[PDB]
């Protein structure tokens, strides 16, 4: 699934600092993805989703999505590792920082984005 004009906030899950472990952050999916390998943990930066399009909750847990800050074309590929209530979704700061390459997304609080899910590979 894909959609556009979607608003990415930011939460400061730190899933790096805190060795990639879905409990530590209180991630919604850490109940079914938790022990997961390590390697799959951290394979992609993790991101909240609640969008228009798609799969959200349980059935999201774990899926991938390429998404383009519309405004500068930049882009990234995050891990679903929770859910959110705000329409869109919310990405680790430091996902957040590497799409936000003209810094307006700071200033204002949020980022416009393009998602479309992708297959996670290995």
């Given amino acids: 699934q894909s959609a556009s004009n979607v608003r990415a906030t930011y939460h400061f899950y730190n899933a790096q600092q805190n060795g990639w472990d879905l409990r530590k952050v209180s991630a919604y999916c850490a109940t079914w993805d938790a022990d ?29 999505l390429r998404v383009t800050n519309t405004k500068t074309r930049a882009e990234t590929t995050v891990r679903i590792v929770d859910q959110c209530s705000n329409g869109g979704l919310d990405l680790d700061w430091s996902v957040f920082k590497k799409l936000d390459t003209d810094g307006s997304g700071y200033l204002r609080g949020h980022l416009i984005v393009n998602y479309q899910f992708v297959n996670c590979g290995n």
């Fill in 36 to 64: 997961k390998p390590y390697s799959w943990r951290s394979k992609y930066g993790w991101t909240a989703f609640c969008g228009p399009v798609g799969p959200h909750g349980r059935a999201a847990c774990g899926k991938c």
